[PDB]
Design a protein around this ligand. Structure first.
Ligand SMILES: [Mn+2]
Ligand SMILES: [Mn+2]
Ligand SMILES: [Mn+2]
Ligand SMILES: [Mn+2]
Lengths: 405, 402
């Protein structure tokens, strides 16, 4: 039933010179960096209402991730934060975290053939209680966070060295003001100076890459954030670093897809966090939505699968967490698949020659092409459940393991 | 014991030297846009009453606006305002001589001039692609136009001994969703690299580049995006120009000023009121305008941000337009000058978010009007609404005998 259909679906695409065999081959190898903090609702293991069954233990969260990976087709990566340090039960200050403290994570990734990405954690800490960190007026506080981002950079280096795949160490900070600033310049000056110091030492790009990440506002962070779109975009260009863009972190109607093509004109590499904003930076699970499709179109038309590091960042505590990961990851795969299966060549020519009629027409007609058939075949070949059947595998794990914790 | 005197003591209690503020305001120049006067007509080759028909009317109109506006200012000129003297000159063939009358008039009144190539309403722009066009001929024509405009800027600054700012804005984009966002942008980057090839001394010319998010006939996609230009300018030591009408809903240019001063020496901005699209309304004394002035003043950037105006309301008196809109940006500056930055920074630095709010808020009822008026006296222009009289007189005898 499944194959003969895919055989028919395959010729529909092939009449456009769309080699689906090739696209499946290319799709098999794009890695998706998934975020750990969905496992335990940003808990972490720092020594000191919502859906049931969250992880509360390193061993619990590692099993959770294994579960989700098994329902997600392909080879992927896991995206770690510093509070996921396993300090062996002895409190270690964030400025003092070391490769030692992520030893097991690495061993575990080796075992499962996963790349590891990293983040310094700059929130939920006494030294960030004032809402400022890298940009706090106090030197002693800035230094602590400088040092910690540096400790973080070394850990990033460690992952790449251990796993033979570069690790991306992304810096995100919450620094801002809830209410109206009487000075927008001084805190940002302090951010540049904190970053200059954080980036002082060269690390081989074969092991670690640095990324900076903007946001327009947070809760308690509404009138102004220090690390803004214009700052980091400038900062990154100046210092040959990576801009990390988060589909939830911009203005209303503001779109990350429109930004990809300009970015690659000036940066060789680009970093992506895909999450679903529902009116604020809310972190709903990624849906196979228009903007998502569009992002995918950009990544593909622009021969950018090797240049756009794709990560996920969402946190929904109201539904099953393993379903969160698998719903959200499959969706970004689906989208890549979809953009793989568009006749870019003819669409380009039509644009080129002002045939806006064919362009609109066929882009639209492609929305009813037989995607499910390919996507379903791809899942069969990739030893993951085929449609909603991964739901059954989640019900077992919820019954047998999750509800039991 | 005159309003001004009393007002001066009120600001005085806060350390604010109002005299100093008035003296530094006196110096700051605003670049008034020309196309307000003849409704973006221009003089090339071929609905409130009495717009300008000719450069002679247009200059005379500008003179009247300036006399109603305190301070010494400038005129932002567009390539289509070329005085071609009865010949038709193709845009890629414009030269200084084409603007001498303009320049000679500027110097007589002690004005600076800014410039812009014109990359719209022309046979070779009819496709909504220009510098990004898929055809080399088209692209070259417009490249050549920009280069020329750069030379004309150069002629400007040499003559008026104040650098001319030549800004590139182009309408390049697509009406419906595009099937490629990159190659057009690659084309634009190549074309700009070719425009900017010849070095020009920064004492006579400065180059800016301007983004829009969307326009009529191009709602889906603009080649020259915010991120495209932010980058380009950074890599090539050029100025960004920010228009307050060219960004997303709720997105403010004031939040951008400070991030940019950290990474470029200068920055231009064009103020216009967007009312739900890039609509070019007369700038009003509003929150976002206060917030812009605030940033410019607090950040020690009065010599770093080149303030221009860019607005076109054909429905109201065209002179009153310039004069409302320009008096507005100056009032904004003044109010930003009469604020306790040092006390307010110390409170933010300290944590005392309470006073920061209270006083930001209290200073909104301070007597700005009494300073504004005294200033307008010293500067010799009509106070309050008196300027309407002069407008009305002028409309009667010149405007409405055309
Ligand atoms: Mn993020
Ligand atoms: Mn987020
Ligand atoms: Mn403009
Ligand atoms: Mn405009």
């Amino acid at each position: 039933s499944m194959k003969s259909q895919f055989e028919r679906a395959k010729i529909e695409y092939g009449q456009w010179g769309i080699d689906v065999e090739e696209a499946l081959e290319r799709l098999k190898q794009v890695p998706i960096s998934i975020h750990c903090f969905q496992g335990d609702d940003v808990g972490g293991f720092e020594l000191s209402g919502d859906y049931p069954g969250k992880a509360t233990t390193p061993e619990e969260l590692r099993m959770d991730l294994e579960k989700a990976l098994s329902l997600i087709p392909g080879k992927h990566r896991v995206n770690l934060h510093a509070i996921y340090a396993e300090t062996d039960g002895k409190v270690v200050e964030r400025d003092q975290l070391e490769p030692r403290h992520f030893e097991k994570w690495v061993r575990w990734a080796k075992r499962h053939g996963l790349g590891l990405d990293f983040n310094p954690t700059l929130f939920s800490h006494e030294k960030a209680k004032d809402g400022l960190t890298l940009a706090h007026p106090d030197q002693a506080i800035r230094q602590f966070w400088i040092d910690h981002c540096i400790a973080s950079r070394k850990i990033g280096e460690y992952f790449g060295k251990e796993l033979e795949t570069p690790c991306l160490t992304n810096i995100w900070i919450p620094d801002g003001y809830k209410d109206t600033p009487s000075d927008r310049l001084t805190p940002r000056k302090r951010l540049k100076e904190s970053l200059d110091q954080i980036f002082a030492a060269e690390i081989n790009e074969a092991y670690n890459l640095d990324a900076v990440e903007s946001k327009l506002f947070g809760i308690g962070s509404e009138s102004y954030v220090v690390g803004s779109h214009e700052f980091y975009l400038s900062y990154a260009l100046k210092n040959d670093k990576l801009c990390l863009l988060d589909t939830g972190h911009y203005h209303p109607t503001e779109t990350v897809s429109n930004k990809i093509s300009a970015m690659l004109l000036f940066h060789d590499k680009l970093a992506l966090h895909v999450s679903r904003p529902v009116r604020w930076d809310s972190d709903h699970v990624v849906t196979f939505d228009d903007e998502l499709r569009e992002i995918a179109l950009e990544i593909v038309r622009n021969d950018a699968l090797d240049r756009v590091l794709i990560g996920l960042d969402f946190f929904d505590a109201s539904i099953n967490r393993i379903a969160a990961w698998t719903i959200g990851t499959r969706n970004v795969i689906k989208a890549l698949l979809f953009a793989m299966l568009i006749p870019h060549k003819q669409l380009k020519e039509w644009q080129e020659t002002g045939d806006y009629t064919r362009r609109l027409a066929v882009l639209e007609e492609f929305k009813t092409y037989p995607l499910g058939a390919i996507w379903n075949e791809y899942c069969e070949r990739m030893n993951v459940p085929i449609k909603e059947e991964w739901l059954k595998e989640i019900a077992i794990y919820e019954k047998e393991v999750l509800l039991q914790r």
